[PDB]
């Protein structure tokens, strides 16, 4: 039992190091994403041209379909309804 607990504690140390590696790298990726967003904002006329929490977990083709479906339902024809079914 002490052998099992020692080996499982070493496995938990390796898993905590992996979670920290994921987090560090993940944080760096998030920072890069923020910079990209800032660049997009800079690139961004706009003045003349001027549900979500469930759509946070959609697949990207499903997310594009959901955005286009809500845009077409609010834009031209109001006889359209969408719903997200799953777990």
């Amino acid at each position: 039992q002490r052998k099992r607990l020692a080996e499982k504690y070493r496995e938990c140390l390796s898993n905590k190091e992996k979670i920290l590696k994921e987090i560090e790298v993940k944080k760096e990726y998030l920072s890069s994403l923020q910079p990209r967003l800032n660049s997009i904002m800079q690139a961004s006329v706009q003045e003349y041209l001027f549900q979500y929490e469930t759509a946070r977990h959609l697949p990207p083709p499903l997310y594009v379909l959901f955005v286009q479906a809500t845009a077409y339902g609010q834009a031209c024809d109001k006889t359209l309804s969408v719903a997200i079914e799953g777990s």
């Binding site: 994403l33 923020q34 990209r36 967003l37 800032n38 997009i40 904002m41 961004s44 706009q46 003349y48 041209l49 001027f50 955005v67 845009a71 834009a75 031209c76």
Partner: peptide, 28 residues
Amino acid sequence: ESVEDKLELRRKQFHVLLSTIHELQQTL
């Protein structure tokens, strides 16, 4: 009147695109 009729559909499409851009701007 023809310019306003074209600018209505142009503002609709650009408003969909600007709604996507504003959602991206509020996201980041």
